[model samples]
Target: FYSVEVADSTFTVLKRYQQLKPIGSGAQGIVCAAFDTVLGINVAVKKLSRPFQNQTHAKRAYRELVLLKCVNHKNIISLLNVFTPQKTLEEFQDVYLVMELMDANLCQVIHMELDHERMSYLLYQMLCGIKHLHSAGIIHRDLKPSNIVVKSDCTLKILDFGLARTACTNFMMTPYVVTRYYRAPEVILGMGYAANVDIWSVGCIMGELVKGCVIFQGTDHIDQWNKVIEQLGTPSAEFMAALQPTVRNYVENRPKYPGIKFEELFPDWIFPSESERDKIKTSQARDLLSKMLVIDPDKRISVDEALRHPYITVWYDPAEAEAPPPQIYDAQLEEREHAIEEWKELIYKEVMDWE
Candidate 1:
């Protein structure tokens, strides 16, 4: 694909890729949809920020490269091509990553009223993507509607690994992980996180798919914990016992809450059931949520099980869900000797070298 070139352009970015229009932008980067003449499709181009400005930005750029370079799954975003606008290492001013353009993100999906099938399929794909990551010993610290993209055809893909962490990583270090509402209990409480942390986020996403609003809206980090406990109710002592004494003592002293039943969690209208099977799936969705939203990491539903749950399994195929595992995470990838500035050059070289 790199052999072919985009036509001459009066543009500010890649000459081989014709910029179409801005699709999205944030602190991470500005993403613009472009026509890749060689790839022969519309691709999303992320123009990452000045990576050398700080340690955090540099690591984000590196981590994104590491994960995207090796991680390939139907439900995870693909790195089709990469390039640097400038010619030399020092001259490099921007890093452009080209990916398959997705029609819309789940943030848009949630705003529009959707039927049961679309909702379930979107969720099934999310789990498939997450399971792929977990199988590789990676945990997506951030799982929210914006990070999840979808095609008009109902295909879903997970992207944006700026906050992702591996099993070997210290969860406590990335305290500002996963978005507030989708955050898991363990993550919120600063406990040892596991793969299921993403599951909790998925659960929250699932709920919002049906609820059409953020399931747990808290003003701040502490308030987020209160919101979770208020809805899910105070977790059992067994789960709290695992926390540090200080954390446990504070939690125990907090106001107690008896969570409402699943009946209140979802309205009858949320589950459109023209068939008895669809009705059963409504109950299945509730059951899955109940298990996934558990406060204790031990009790939270695993991604493997969540895929098999009746609600999402309706669209599952072993070929896609059971694809061979991704290359497991390696320590050396995260352990680096080069300075962040050198890391920037490495990434610049990688982009320039992309063919």
Candidate 2:
């Protein structure tokens, strides 16, 4: 074992992981790329950021650990190993997750000129991963591009399940659950969200894939709501029927917007035209976006339908898209409310067991 300091945190990793170099850092934690001598491959190790900082942080750490341990899919991040430097539960404080390393996240690739084949393939894998999660009653509340990573060969996988929640539970859905730029209109309106919420994020990411920038660059939550309706137009009466009275009043009072057509929003010039299929594929891509970006949750496309859309269907394989579901995730942990210390103890045990 060896000890190293990174970003004001100490990482005591096994000797197997050598040459640790910092790769990325965020509120969630710091990540480093390390070589595994035993496996003879490179891997990414993540130190959960401040797991014991508060009840929220502790619960998030526990959830990330449990979900990552349970989920098994090629398009989803695999939990290769877990460790804690502390020797006992009382001293346990830090948790580290080791996973397969990839070339870069979609955030880095979104700006590149990716043709339809590449773009659709990337999106196809995203949908496949999201579908696997949905099958197990998990909703990836956060589905931003940075949460998705890709290989140099363009293979993609979803990661960062710290914010994911079981869909079987119900609560007041929070607007803060998703990054503002990728938030669904229902989330902004404070309506109860479902699995389709993730589809909205996929649409945002896909739009960014074509435009080379975020589609809705909102300054704040309020401005985020405005940005959505301004571009997608006001919701239908039926869609508004689900909102609370205060929200409905505010939405009804806002100036009516007919919205820009998808064809205009996604012009043909922006897409790849290397072959004849490019033109038709562009329109198919636009249609999928229009369906996915719908303000009404009822109108939004589901993961299964998105996989079958002509744009993505080109690369669809039954085995990849419809892999048998992983073992059903246990929801008791999610349903049970625990204090910071309780969650800390549970997570400490998880790492110990993993070791």
Candidate 3:
């Protein structure tokens, strides 16, 4: 392994990964594009960020490794390899994951003037990838444009599982889960949610693709809720009844809104205007958005339903839509608590076995 220093950390990777260049960074980790000598192709390398800094960080690192290793889907990022610079567990301080490199993230493409075909195709792949996760009983708690990457040919793959969780009905989700703009109504209200939560994010991303900006640009989580209800209207009595006492009162008292119609919210002028085919698809796309952006999780569209939508079904292949399920994850692993050292050893062993 050779070590090269980057912005705030050093990347110690196997000799097979060469010509490393930093491409992105965050609290989660730093990513670099490197040429995989063995495969003769470019790959992205992510050095997990302070993975053992605390029990929380350690568990996150473990969850990501387990999820990526078990999942095998074309729309999902493929984990090419895993490594640690150290030869012994005691010296293990960094973990690097190698993945196929894609041309750009949705953040770069969201602002582009995408035609109906391109937009719908990109979103179809997004839904297909998510369906793969949902079928295996996993929920991608965080789904946003930045986490979705694409190839030059518009091939899309979902990445970053640091926040994903196994779908166990008994547990409560973290309230402040996804990015503020893409956060679902249930998540913002501290209510229990399901796989449909990701659908809300997909709606937000799809909206941004057409509008060329964030649909809900909240300053914080509190304001995030306001932004949602203000545009989508307040939740129904049945929806509010499920909330905690304090949350219900606070929510009930907020300025009531009748909500704007989807036609007005997503006017036809905002979409592509190439021909009659484009006109029909534009309305169909908005209908999908309306179903996905519903305030109540129970009412929100499921991944399966969204994939079958007219706007998306156009590009769907039975092969891709119903791909073989990944190995069902060991749900107990997420429930098991481990100390930093224990997690370090577990990750160390996983990477070593990969080698």
Candidate 4:
């Protein structure tokens, strides 16, 4: 871990020849633009702020950094270095993690362009990342477009560790960690879920990418569960019987509707072109989505199976595919930088003012 210093009420470099510039803020931490003076390379620095009481959360962040460093996959973000304060800063002890800097998140890209080929490519990349994670016995737990970043080369990089957890441990059973819209059905049901939870999120992301909107755009947890049931139909009797008591109770109380088949969910109104609709119906796409969005976690697709799906084989090829267009944001970079600075100031005040 690199050592850092704090002086004159600001972060100061102690042992490294690098400068950190604030770039973005999130619920758990702030990301900074860092330049390695010696190497002449730019990186995004993720710093954890003090004053949060949960030690488990801190451990999770550290664990993710260590785990990511060991795993190498093209679709996953690269962890360059980590900084732990030398027990010298009294006000707040922080951890600085250096990572690859990407142009923007997939959510931003989806908003900019909603093409089918783009969605297919994005999904392939995501599966590649998730497949690697599962092979290493890790579960992303949190899988949403916001966590998937697009680099200047237009490649995807998965980010954020605040909600990610290991699959081999007791972590997956931890309650309610995923974002609302992308959360899995078992998660919403409060069941003791597993790696399959991530697969469920992949399904949601696929739907959102294809439709240019969230398929289950529910305002609340209950509504989200209703949307899930409405689209995929009720869970099987065997599945309901095996769920945790609380989960079963919740489902039992919810209203039931005539079950829907997968084909019925995709009406011509939503998908006008038969060719486009056929793409979704093909085994390459539908099979993967079905496994990920299974009503029962037990029936959900395993990460290994997902990686072996024809969809991945059809789209992902590391050596041959042409590289995506370069990210040209020079005209908008200044404006975005300015906006980010304002956001940083707001976030800093909010965190520092806390007692």
Candidate 5:
């Protein structure tokens, strides 16, 4: 066991046998593979960045773990444990959370395989995950292909909890999270949003999966709204009048969306040719996407409704689709060990040069 002292408290080194290796880096934290010497287990560790100034980051991490612990569904990631080291008497170390490692994210798989069936199956799994989340009153504000992980057997795990929050709470504040491409219009417009935000993002992901490209890959905030308005038309006067002044101010100068007629925005109906449309229909991909992409968040399909959508239930066997037990891997464990050694070397050299 290797031990490091942090903030006045001494935490016995549980496992220093394997080095932790970096796997993914995001806005919130860096994910790494670490070995537990006591349990002889391999776990995914998310270490908070030292410079994270926002308290929300830590709060969100704790909330995600709490929610994960309460939820027993297989579609969601399993939260094993959380650790915050108390360093020398004067300083507290960063937060570190341990959980199961997923095989690879959906974005990586999309880059490797472009089959319609595979894509449709992936979409189905995503709906199932979101359904589970909503049932628990949690909302995954961020939903994108990159946030979804696919195991070797094609099971999907939605990762990244930095932007997740409990829905149905009236005390929540203005919108700030979510990537621009996958964000809901209400969120971008600065209107307060809830679980429907995830639904909108899921719809965006579904569109990209079926269309083989992002439907609205806007370069900036204004361009994003312009694309939405262009496709879905402008919000009604009544709707705009109900929005907060900040939201109204932001969108007041922007052009309104033409209308919600799909044919108008996509003269070719997003399929372009009969053959292309045939491919999507044969896969039954567009049915769910259309339901999710509705411009009106109130009209957008809810997670429960989406789970029952013909597009998901017809193709995916509900019984067989239940979440599976978390699987641990040895190969990835070894890979992580090697990565930790390399990162340590880099950090040491960087620190020495600074000194």
Candidate 6:
């Protein structure tokens, strides 16, 4: 192993690859761009910290690894390889996960003036990815611009499964599952949620693509609920009745305002005006958004329905959406119960399996 001691830390990366430079870092890990000479391509390696700092982090690492290994959708990030420099459990502290390098994340693309085709196609690919995830009873609890990456060719992929979870058959998921801006009403109210939770996130992403700003800018959980209800203008009685009592009463007491029409929400000026622009494209987009942004999880558009929407259907290829999902086993979930030491052992087994 080729190793180097930096100012703050040490590197023991596989000698087959040359570390180029740092790309980004987060609470999970620091990622660096690197050239994989063996594969003759560039890749991003996320060097995770605190792998055994706590049970939560260990479980997150385990969950991310298993889901990435299992799922093989065209629009989901592919795990190229995973390794650890540690020779024994005592030395195992850092975990590195290698993935296909993406040109940019959706954050950058959301700012560019994307035409109908580009925007709709991006949304289509996301739905395709999400549909595949949902089919396996998985929920990408975290769906935001930064977590969704794109290639120069406009190929999109969903990443960051650390916060993702398999759909639960029970009720009342914690409100902390998603980022506040894109979290669904069901999540905020701490009610039973389904895969539609992700649809709410997709809707916010679409709105941002249209308006060039976050649709809901909330400072806290309460504020997030206020922001969503303020614009969407409070849901129907049946929907409000279904919410957990305290949440329902608070939501009911908020001064109700009729939501703006989709046309008013996403005006024509926000859309591109090129000759290639179909006049009906805007309508299709708004229709799809309306379906996705529904406050009631039951009323929300499903991944299958969203992919088949006129706005997204134009980019749909059956081969892509209907592809095989990952093979799921009960062991995948049970892994979460093990201690940090056991998790590290499992990860070593995983890397050897790849070998």
Alpha-carbon shift of residue 46 in model 4 (angstroms): 1.8
What digit string (tens of lDDT, one per residue) describes model 4 on residues 253-295? 6777655665655443443245854455353565567677777
lDDT of 5 at 77: 75
Alpha-carbon RMSD, each predicted model: 4.1, 3.1, 3.1, 11.2, 10.7, 3.3
lDDT per residue, candidate 3, 145-235, as tens digits?
8889999798999986636554433332233444668878787688867888889999999999999989999988779888888889998
lDDT of each: 0.76, 0.81, 0.83, 0.62, 0.61, 0.78
User: What tens-digit string does per-residue lDDT give for candidate 5 at 200-311?
Assistant: 8888876665456777789888888888887777777767777788777666657655565544433344442357645545435556666788766877888777777755
Residue 113: error of model 6 in Å?
Answer: 0.7
lDDT (Cα, tens digit) per residue for candidate 2, span 1-355: 7666554566778889888888877666678899999999999998875486566566667777887888778899989999877788887767788999988888899888898889999999899888888887778867888889999999999977635453432431322444568877776688868998999999999999889999998988788888888898988877676679999889888888999999899988999766788888888888999999888888789999998898888886656444567663555766757766777777787788787
Determine the C-alpha RMSD for candidate 6 after optimal superposition of all C-alphas.
3.3
**1-355 in candidate 1: lDDT tens per residue?**
1222322222255556775677876666457788877667888877675675555566667677767877778899999877765657878766667899999888898877887788888888898888888777678867899889999888889976535443334321233444577877786587968778889898899889888899889888778888888888998888787788888888988999998777787856678888987788788878888888888888788999988888888886656445676663545655554566787776776666574
TM-score of each: 0.88, 0.92, 0.92, 0.71, 0.69, 0.91
lDDT of 6 by residue, 273-310 (tens): 55545668887888998898888888888888888788
Q: For residue 169, give model 2's deviation from the true position in Å.
A: 16
Better of 1 and 3 by lDDT: 3
Candidate 6 local distance difference test against the native = 0.78
Residue-pair clashes per prediction, in order, are 0, 0, 0, 0, 16, 0
143, model 6: CA deviation in Å?
0.4
Model 5 gets an lDDT of 0.61
Between 2 and 5, whose lDDT is larger?
A: 2
* Cα error, candidate 2, residue 22 (Å): 1.3
| Model 3 regions more than 4 Å off | 1-8, 162-178, 319-322, 328-331
Candidate 1 pairs with clashing backbones:
none
Off by over 4 Å in 4: 1-21, 51-54, 84-92, 160-178, 244-250, 259-261, 267-287, 318-355
Q: For model 4, what is the error of residue 74's alpha carbon versus the real structure, in angstroms, after optimal superposition?
A: 1.9
